[PDB]
Structure formats: structure tokens, C-alpha cells
Design a protein around this ligand. Sequence first.
Ligand SMILES: [Zn+2]
Ligand SMILES: [Zn+2]
Lengths: 77, 78
Amino acid sequence: FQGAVVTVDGEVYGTYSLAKDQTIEIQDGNRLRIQNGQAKMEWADCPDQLCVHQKAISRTGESIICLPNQVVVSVQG
Amino acid sequence: YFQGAVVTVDGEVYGTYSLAKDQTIEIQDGNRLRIQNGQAKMEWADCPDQLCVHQKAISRTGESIICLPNQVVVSVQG
Ligand SMILES: [Zn+2]
Ligand SMILES: [Zn+2]
């Protein structure tokens, strides 16, 4: 399956299918929304809010990162 | 203040490299980043999937290139 791989401090947190609408609360500091086959950072407690402003991802290799919270979201097949 | 490519390996910041200067960053033995014409691109990697090498060049704040097998994160900050 094609999913959004989430790593926190370099450790794989989980892999979430893009084909299923879901909301992932990543260790209280980030919230990922999977909707219509795309992953987007819906909310974050980081000061810069850069992760929240990155465009939704759906293609293999694409990523969303929250550097202050060491969160990496990546699309893997 | 400058626009640069922040490189993290295993969550540790290695450095920030100005996008305004053409340079090659050899990130340990597994990844090589090329800064050229104000853009950062993964030129080479020893990873099996080669996904980082196929990612589009980045130049805008927040944009990223990641090599998941080698725990390399490249991000534009500033
Ligand atoms: Zn963030
Ligand atoms: Zn790679």
C-alpha cells in the first residue's frame, strides 16, 4: 500500500494509508490529516508554523517536515 | 540573515548552507547534496529506493528533500 510514513526523532511512529481518511496526532505537538489521498500537516505547536504551510503530499518520495519537533512525514510505496 | 539548506543526519543539525553559493555537500558516505543556481538537489545517494535523488530541487522556505534509509533531512530555512 501507498502510505504516509511518520518519523519522530528518527524513529518510525507508523505508516498510514493515503486511501483512508484519518487524523494522526503525533506526540501532542503535530497533527496530520489524511484526506482525499493526500497528507497535510493540519496543526502544530511549533513557533515558525512552516510544516502547516507546506502543500499536501501524495507522491512517493514527497515530504512534510517539522524541524522544531523533529517530525518527518514522507510518502512511501 | 540568509536563505540556506539545513541538513540533519539522525536528527542532528550538521550545518546550514547558503543557496546563493554553488557547493557540493557530501553527507557522510551515503548522500551528496548539490547547491546550484539557488536550489538544493540530492545529486547522489547509496540508498536502495533512490527516492531522495528523484525529488525535485528545493529553494523555498519550508520545502524539503529526505532520504529515509540514511535518516537525512534537507530543508530550506530563512
Ligand atoms: Zn512545525
Ligand atoms: Zn535516499
